[PDB]
Amino acid sequence: WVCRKTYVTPRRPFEKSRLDQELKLIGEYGLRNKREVWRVKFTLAKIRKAARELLTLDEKDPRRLFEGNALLRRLVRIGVLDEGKMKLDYILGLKIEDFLERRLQTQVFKLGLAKSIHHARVLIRQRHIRVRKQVVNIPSFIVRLDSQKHIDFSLRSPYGGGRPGRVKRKNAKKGQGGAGAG
Amino acid sequence: FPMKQGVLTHGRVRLLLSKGHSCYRPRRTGERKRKSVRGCIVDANLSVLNLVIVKKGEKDIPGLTDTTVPRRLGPKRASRIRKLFNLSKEDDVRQYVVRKPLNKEGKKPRTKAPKIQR
Amino acid sequence: KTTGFGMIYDSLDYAKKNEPKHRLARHGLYEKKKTSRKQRKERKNRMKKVRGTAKANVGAG
Amino acid sequence: MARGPKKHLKRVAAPKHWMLDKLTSVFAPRPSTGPHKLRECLPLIIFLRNKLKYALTGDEVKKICMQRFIKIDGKVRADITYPAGFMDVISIDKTGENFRLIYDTKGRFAVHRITPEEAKYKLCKVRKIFVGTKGIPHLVTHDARTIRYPDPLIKMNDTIQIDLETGKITDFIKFDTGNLCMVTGGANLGRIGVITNRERHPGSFDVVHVKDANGNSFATRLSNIFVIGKGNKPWISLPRGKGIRLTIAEERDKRLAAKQSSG
Amino acid sequence: KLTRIAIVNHDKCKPKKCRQECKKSCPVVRMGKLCIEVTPQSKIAWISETLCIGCGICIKKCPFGALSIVNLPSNLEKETTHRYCANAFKLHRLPIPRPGEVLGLVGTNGIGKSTALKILAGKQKPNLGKYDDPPDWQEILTYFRGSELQNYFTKILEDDLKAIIKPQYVDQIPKAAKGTVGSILDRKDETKTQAIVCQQLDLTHLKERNVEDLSGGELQRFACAVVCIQKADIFMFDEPSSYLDVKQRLKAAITIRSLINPDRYIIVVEHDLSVLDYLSDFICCLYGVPSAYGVVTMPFSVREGINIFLDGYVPTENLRFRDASLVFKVAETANEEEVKKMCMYKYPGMKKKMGEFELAIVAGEFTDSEIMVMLGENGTGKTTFIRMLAGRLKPDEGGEVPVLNVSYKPQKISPKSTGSVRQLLHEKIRDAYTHPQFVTDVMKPLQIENIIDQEVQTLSGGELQRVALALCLGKPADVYLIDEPSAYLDSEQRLMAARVVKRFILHAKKTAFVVEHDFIMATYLADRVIVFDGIPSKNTVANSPQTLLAGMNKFLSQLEITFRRDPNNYRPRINKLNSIKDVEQKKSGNYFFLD
Amino acid sequence: QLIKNGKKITAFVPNDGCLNFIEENDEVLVAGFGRKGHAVGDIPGVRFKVVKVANVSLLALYKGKKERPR
RNA sequence: CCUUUAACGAGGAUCCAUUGGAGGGCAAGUCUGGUCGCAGCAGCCGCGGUAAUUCCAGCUCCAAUAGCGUAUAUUAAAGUU
RNA sequence: GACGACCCAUUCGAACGUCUGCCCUAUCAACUUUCGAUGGUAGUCGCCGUGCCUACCAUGGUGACCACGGGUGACGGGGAAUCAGGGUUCGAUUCCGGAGAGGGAGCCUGAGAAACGGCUACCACAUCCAAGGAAGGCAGCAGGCGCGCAAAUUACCCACUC
RNA sequence: UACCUGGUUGAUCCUGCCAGUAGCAUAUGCUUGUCUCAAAGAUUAAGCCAUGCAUGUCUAAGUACGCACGGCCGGUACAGUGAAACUGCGAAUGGCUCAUUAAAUCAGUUAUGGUUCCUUUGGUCGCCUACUUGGAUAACUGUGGUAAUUC
Ligand SMILES: Nc1nc2c(ncn2[C@@H]2O[C@H](COP(=O)(O)OP(=O)(O)NP(=O)(O)O)[C@@H](O)[C@H]2O)c(=O)[nH]1
Ligand SMILES: Nc1nc2c(ncn2[C@@H]2O[C@H](COP(=O)(O)OP(=O)(O)NP(=O)(O)O)[C@@H](O)[C@H]2O)c(=O)[nH]1
Ligand code: SF4
Ligand code: SF4
Ligand SMILES: [Mg+2]
User: Which listed CATH number (1.20.1600.10, 3.40.30.10, 3.40.1370.10, 3.40.50.300) goes with E351-588?
Assistant: First the structure.
């Protein structure tokens, strides 16, 4: 039906300067590939293009008002922008890293219960967390501002209340069939 | 190949045919085919002929005219019953219909009648 | 959570009349036969090529 | 393809004021022939399962219409599709409900419920005057009624009240400046406002200025205007919205003010 | 995957006005080997079979569209419905069992027809390549998903379609099962249809008689009868028309034809002349190499399929090689040296009897270095007479003892000799007239080597018949007794073998009593014909021996059935019981045209 | 020589010992070098190369993960 | 099929990630063995004539990654229309 | 209530006509005409307007602002890929319009067709035949052969959408 | 992201092309766990085709003497259920292909005061017969022809 790409490739194939930035950025946040990086940078450069229009439109054009007002609300609703700013010039001061703070795996680590970031991604996938009432398996949730005070573990897991795993209950049955009857 | 009327000398001719002619069956309305047929004039090139008895002779042929079979059905229409039994305009036909027996059915015999029209 | 869609009829006969057949047969009171598919079309085209009497093909093949 | 008339209309060919989806199949209903035109119709079955949601499949509507609970213009109809359009009355007497088909300021046929007393008549525009045989006149209307012996001062672009029970119009409005009008087609649709001014061009495509009670002036073609009653005084009931034609900014402000998406 | 080759002759294929681009632009005729051989000449362009790689380049730029492209048959591990193991037969396709018509299945011998029936029956289930670690009612249904046989096989599972088959062989059975007279067939099943079957089977004779006293006729009859009376869903007839009378065969085809119409599936086999016109309505042909690989072609109309099977190679639509004249002998030839000397024997007019049979012989001349043909109807007393003359029972009064040793051809062939065929060939000798002989029946095209080795227990009908054909010119004997060699052979294999048998016994000076039910089998193999006349289980008269023509006329005058010569190819074609011309031939009495 | 034109083309064979895996009077599949009209490298008169012998790649013949199908 | 749920289901040796490249352009070996203008590589510039950072192999390293390589049409690069 | 019928209006259209918009080529520069080319007058025909056709009469019409002729792996449009700005390239193909059912021509029925899941003939093919005759058109869904670098199941079903 | 890099010389600066670079869509090689969406014999031959199927249709309401089923007994329009057959209507819609076609097709814009229009919707409905007219065809019954046909 309707399909389109969510990322673009770099114009240069190789460049010592570029590769180090993409590598070290992936190291911090535990990302799997550069396709998880360029995805972010497509969205950002798209938003940077839309903003770049409206600044050149006449001040108090109706198109410029209605777009900007509802746009900045969305940037504030995800929390990559403040309302102590609230104008279009600060869109261009926005950059790549601020998004990545609002990723699920980043917020698990930063404001919750994890070891290193590499641990935290595994917890999201193995279904040990929820967002308000709802299980997730996607570390690319990007998390709305309101939902940061509802990040909790899951209500059926061995982490908190719920049935144990098959490593524990296995060893429990080693007390009954591994050394209790075997 | 069948024989039809109005197809002088006895060759085998391919005529255009359509509804309202001998030896045609339409499978669609307005359809016209061009089938072969064969003439009127009799020869010994024919498989079989149909002869209708018109005048009956002195004698009776054993296998046909001695045998007697009644015709099956009376009329279904009103005015044919009037003409048949020679009723007046005022007599109110309601009991002058032929009653057609159902011979058996393992239940009881019926007598059927048709439904009058007009 | 699970979410579905339910009807409740006032009487049986209002359901039994309206109701698509498979929903009535879903908890049985009706079936289908009929019988698979195909046996219909191959019979139809054979019935097409007779006239007057087609009672052999309807029972008889 | 064509050698004669067509009998299908697809989903995506169909107009957008029936508000069709795109994940039910290729075909759309297509209204059958009748008094209204298919870019001005609301087909019957689209009222019964894509608005009010009594029915759920087209087969259900076939089982409903046969029972003869449905009327349209006070007469009984009994088919899946019928081409009812602007200014007709649907009447379900079992539920005791009556609808009217009229335009939102968005420009689409809404639900405008009404008293049964209001639903005993409708407002009809005159389009053509035609002298019949032996000195008898005729009217012609957009709902395609031919009403003989009208009053001899009624002319085209006027509107007339028709009693569905007996035909034979009781009263009328005369087209004059400062009377209240509704739009029935074109880019402006569903707006309500007084006539204000007229403009004439010998030839065709005369236009008609309009002004509302919100202090806005706009214009439209002549043949998309319909009269509803005298100045600031409709002779019909009006829905919510009332031809204001708000900007998108103000509509945003209302929704976040009432905070309305829950009850 | 397959084979490709060029073909050349066409209406004004003109090597004398095209400069010969086929020779000029062929890749093979450039690298040294002459594939395409041509000159400016009065004949056609010549093109080889073996050296053609395929390509089709010559075709695209020959100036006249004379040269076409064929594709020859080959295996390429494709479909593969089953195999037994390795270095052994395999089959690819088993196709649509179309209901409401009878499916006619028509290929050379040892090609997998019987095997396809076994698979269709659900009994020997298909293995499809491998070896066959998948079954079980799942994996094969997944493999032939998207098609039809999913619906068929699931309906089988569930035994909604109930299986019945008529078996290929008689022998193991009248041996494996046993039969109570009357009572047996009786508590078989049930009513009106058995009465229709046994009465339209035209028997009326074996109602009060024990099975062991009966022969081919009775056997086949009872078999078919029971099979039909068998209340079931499917139905299969393998080879139903072997060793049966010509009149009786037609009435077998129409009793099979009774079962067809109302959503029922029906599969028939056969190796026909032109009776398959009434057997089937769809004809499905099988090709390949005998006892190596068999491929089933998609089904055709009977008229269209018949000729294309005997035409010599019809493809379009694929393609192959061989196949042609065989529905006769078209072996134009005759004449010898001086034939000196000879004799006049003569066998006397003996009267013979058993219990329910009065069997009579008339005196006749049984000439030296000369054939004798027996028929005549099933039950017309031919086989047991020959045994009674040789030594078994008889006579009450008189007889003539054979001057020459004797060669016994049997008809009831189901022999039991454990070990190998090669052991039995040592009870004959393979040194005598050592220059070809068995090798002149078969060696190069259908293979023998093919007749040794292996077991006789697992050997198929025509090959098993060929074991019996060898057992006759193989002990030292010169007067030959042969009943039914046409049993389990086709047209391709029978007619050449029959001509070879006649050449042997006539040329080195012998005499043979041949008991054929085959026009082509009887004709080309005939002379005297001697004619047997009379009603089964009553009376048998061998008619005082007269003329091939006059004797064949006596047989077909009573039966009321006739033949037509196929005018282009000299081939026999049976008449449809009662026609139009079926009246000129009856009057002209003439049932053969063009000597 | 080609199937569909009957005209002649001179085609390179890649890596060491791959010549042996091409046998005379069989089919092959050809392809351009990667310069789209012009002769490549130090070899003149060649504008085409070879990729598949008979539904089997020069790679798998060379590396040894497949064998000749004959 | 998906989602939902019993019961089995991970100790790294297997419940196994590949496709190309490492002289420059262009991110990564003046490591070891074999070959010696032969065999081959090489879009381009150029490598091989007995001490080959470019060939054939081993080890190591680099890029992208459930994808990567190759051929061809075509756009951007081209202010070389 | 059901059906039918005459006329008017309406709806769904159908058919002609207005103005503007087109890729390559001059090693295509003059083209068109009693075998009507352009116009006038009258008539025939057609659902109607009209050289559409016929009779009579006039001699016009078109072009360097590219006619006329030739070419196109040219169906047209809504669109697609790339892209700072300006562009370039593609559009068989789900919506709309058009044309055609092997190649040509003619015609029946009907409100509507010059119809091919209608018909007749010729031409190119191909099938059956007892040789007298008869029957056929997958650029519909599947499927086969052929062609090639190159492309799927002789499956299940009217429940949804119409 | 409005970007360039290598190659003519002993060396330098130009002109200029070749090669490198990124996207897109077709073919092809090698490899391949899990999840959703789905394009697909157009390119070439609008080449040729076995078999199967793809258009039919009855309500209280056009026509029921099927020796059909049924009946509660019938026929006095006369049953209930009803195969077949006549009649009405549809089969000109859809589906498919891109061969033809350069002011043609087609798009926007306009015109019927130059015309036709099934159908729906609304109007139009009185200048030895009328208590109802005339005579044949099918199904059906029965006999046939042809190698063969929805003859
Ligand atoms: N080794 C072996 N071969 C077998 C077996 N069954 C059949 N065959 C072989 O398979 C081939 C074909 O068998 P079959 O289907 O009976 O052949 P047919 O086509 O029916 N033969 P015919 O035409 O003479 O009637 C023959 O070469 C036969 O020997 C078996 O169990 N074992
Ligand atoms: N009553 C009776 N019949 C027997 C006896 N033995 C054999 N018959 C039958 O008598 C008949 C004699 O003719 P036969 O030579 O067998 O015929 P055929 O040569 O087999 N003819 P066909 O092959 O056409 O069937 C056969 O049908 C045979 O079965 C017996 O003891 N009693
Ligand atoms: S085949 Fe074509 S080319 Fe070869 S000879 Fe006959 S015509 Fe000349
Ligand atoms: S077919 Fe291939 S090989 Fe046989 S002739 Fe034509 S070209 Fe030569
Ligand atoms: Mg066999």
Answer: 3.40.50.300
